[PDB]
């Protein structure tokens, strides 16, 4: 689809059988989702942006469905203000910025 | 053009006689730039990131050239780790996400 930007680019994603609303963020290297338990081992990590750092749990090779498009990659879980889909998964679904 | 996301989407922007590299950020409601004096009245504002909030100065009706595309709007100035072009200006140059 084509998403305009007059409103925040929020889409529905499916992960671990649960539906969640997430922001398509070209300004994020990685994908960060709100606190939730996911299967598989995880490693502690620290990521940052405006305001400073936060501690997250890194899960690898996690299948995520974005607007019907499948992706399998790294997902960070932590106290983020909104679910964020970063470039690591945006590239997998073939997302581009155009103008 | 069509910008792929294998790498951070940085572009050159022009403000007055000033050149700066800025990130085309669909995950940002507003545009914030790193230290640079702008003309006119400015109002204090608080904006939120992944780790908390920072204080910035809000300047309105600022002409900004993005990749040969003219845009005019609110520009925030504060301690952002990266110059950011937010949705307020991305909409003016007809920028969309596509997949």
């Amino acid at each position: 689809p084509q998403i305009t930007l007059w409103k925040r680019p929020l889409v529905t994603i499916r992960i671990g059988g649960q539906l969640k609303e997430a922001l398509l963020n070209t300004g994020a290297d990685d994908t960060v989702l709100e606190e939730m338990n996911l299967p598989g081992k995880w490693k502690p990590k620290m990521i940052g942006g405006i305001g400073g750092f936060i501690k997250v749990r890194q899960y690898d090779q996690i299948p995520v469905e974005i607007c019907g498009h499948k992706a399998i990659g790294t997902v960070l879980v932590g106290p983020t203000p909104v679910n964020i889909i970063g470039r690591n998964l945006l590239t997998q679904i073939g997302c581009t910025l155009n103008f | 053009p069509q910008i792929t996301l294998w790498k951070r989407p940085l572009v050159t922007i022009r403000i007055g006689g000033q050149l700066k590299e800025a990130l085309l950020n669909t995950g940002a409601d507003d545009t914030v730039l790193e230290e640079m004096n702008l003309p006119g009245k400015w109002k204090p504002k608080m904006i939120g990131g992944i780790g908390g909030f920072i204080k910035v100065r809000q300047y309105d009706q600022i002409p900004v050239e993005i990749c040969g595309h003219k845009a005019i709007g609110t520009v925030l100035v504060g301690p952002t780790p990266v110059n950011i072009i937010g949705r307020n200006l991305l909409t003016q140059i007809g920028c969309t996400l596509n997949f």
């Binding site: 922001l23 963020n25 300004g27 994020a28 290297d29 990685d30 960060v32 990521i47 940052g48 942006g49 405006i50 400073g52 750092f53 983020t80 203000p81 909104v82 964020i84 970063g86 | 990130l23 950020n25 995950g27 940002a28 409601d29 507003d30 914030v32 904006i47 939120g48 990131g49 992944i50 952002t80 780790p81 990266v82 950011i84 937010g86 307020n88």
Partner: peptide, 10 residues
Amino acid sequence: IRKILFLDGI
């Protein structure tokens, strides 16, 4: 520090 640049304008 510049990896996740979400920015809330409110």
